[PDB]
Amino acid sequence: AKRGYSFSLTTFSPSGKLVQIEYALAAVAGGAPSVGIKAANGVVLATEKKQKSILYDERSVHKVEPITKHIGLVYSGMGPDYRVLVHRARKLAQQYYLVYQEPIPTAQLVQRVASVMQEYTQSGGVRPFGVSLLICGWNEGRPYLFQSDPSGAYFAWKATAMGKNYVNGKTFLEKRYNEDLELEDAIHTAILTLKESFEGQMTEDNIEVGICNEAGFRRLTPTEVRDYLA
């Protein structure tokens, strides 16, 4: 028999800073690098999927996940916490569709998912999520890219990077990224930003990449990743 704690594990310090959120921000900042780019006619999301051993089955688990027909997810930080947010976001997407009979606007999903992240910064007996989410989507004939973080705050991006070397990844994108890209060009600059922080040689198994357009969201097959790696 058990009964949970009813007191907040995230409190205000004398400085006025919620320490556990910034500590959760350290968990994502130390995780594997991820990059997202909004490119006029579509969105691309890419991440480092280096399992650091040849024993692993690279096909079993995925980091780039679909939420619905038109929305995808990538993360930096902890895998287990990310899974919870995926399952919650998939349910929120269906809850919206059952009520309105319309594919959920990306901005509306991120708002609903970020609100779940907010709970774990105030609710009793729980720690915040150690994950920053990268949400892509297509609705009203327009590409969307969003960032959700442990705080529960959300930001809209043209292009951004998170995880290891997120500071060097962003400055790279400031110079490299230009508006009005083609989707196929966006995959290149996504892998290029990922190469800046890699360490090792890139194979189609070492990285994972998903794309979102007017035809919906899908993860690129290992054969498709190999062709861009040249």
Partner 1 sequence: SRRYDSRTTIFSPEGRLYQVEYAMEAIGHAGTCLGILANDGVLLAAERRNIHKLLDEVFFSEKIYKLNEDMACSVAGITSDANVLTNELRLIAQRYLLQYQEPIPCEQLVTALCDIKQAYTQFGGKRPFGVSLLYIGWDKHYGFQLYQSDPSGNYGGWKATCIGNNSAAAVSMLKQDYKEGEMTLKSALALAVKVLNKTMDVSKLSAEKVEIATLTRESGKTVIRVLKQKEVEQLIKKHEEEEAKAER
Partner 2 sequence: SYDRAITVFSPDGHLFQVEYAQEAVKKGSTAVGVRGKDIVVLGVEKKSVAKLQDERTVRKICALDDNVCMAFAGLTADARIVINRARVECQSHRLTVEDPVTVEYITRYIASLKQRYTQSNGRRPFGISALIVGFDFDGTPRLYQTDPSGTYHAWKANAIGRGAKSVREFLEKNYTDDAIETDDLTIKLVIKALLEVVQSGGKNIELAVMRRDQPLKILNPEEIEKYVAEIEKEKEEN
Partner 3 sequence: SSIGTGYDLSASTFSPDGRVFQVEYAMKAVENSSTAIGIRCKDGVVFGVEKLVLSKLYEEGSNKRLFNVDRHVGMAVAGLLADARSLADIAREEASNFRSNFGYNIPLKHLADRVAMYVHAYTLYSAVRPFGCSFMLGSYSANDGAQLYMIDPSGVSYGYWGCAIGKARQAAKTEIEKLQMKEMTCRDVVKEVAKIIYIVHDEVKDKAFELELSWVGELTKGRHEIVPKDIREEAEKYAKESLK
Binding mask 119-148 for partner 1 (x = CB under 8 A): --xxxx-------------------xx---
Indicate the residue among 5 and 100 with the shorter CB distance to partner 2. Answer: 5
CA–CA dist 167, 197 (Å, integer): 11
Q: Examine residue 26 and tell whether it contacts partner 1 (CB under 8 A).
A: no
Residue 208, burial from CB neighbour count under 10 angstroms (0-12, 13-18, 19+): buried
Give the burial string for 168-202 (b: 16+ CB within 10 Å, else e).
ebbebbeeebeeebebeebbbbbbebbebbbeeee
Which amino acid type is present at position 146? F
Binding segment (CB under 8 A) for partner 3, from list 1-9, 44-52, 128-136, 208-216: 1-9
Q: 3-class DSSP state for residue 40? A: coil
Indicate the residue among 2 and 52 with the shorter CB distance to partner 3. Answer: 2
Q: Examine residue 53 and tell whether it contacts Cl ion (CB under 5 A).
A: no
Indicate the residue among 7 and 199 with the shorter CB distance to partner 2. Answer: 7
Q: Cβ distance 42 to 211 under 8 Å?
A: yes
In the chain the first and final C-alpha atoms are separated, in Å, by 58
Q: 3-class DSSP state for residue 100? A: helix
Q: Which of 100, 115, 182, 215 binds partner 1 (CB under 8 A)?
A: 115
Q: Examine residue 7 and tell whether it contacts partner 3 (CB under 8 A).
A: no
Q: Examine residue 11 and tell whether it contacts partner 1 (CB under 8 A).
A: yes
Q: Examine residue 1 and tell whether it contacts partner 3 (CB under 8 A).
A: yes
Binding mask 187-216 for partner 2 (x = CB under 8 A): ------------------------------
Q: Examine residue 3 and tell whether it contacts partner 3 (CB under 8 A).
A: yes
Question: Rule CB under 8 A: which residues touch partner 2?
Answer: 6-7, 124
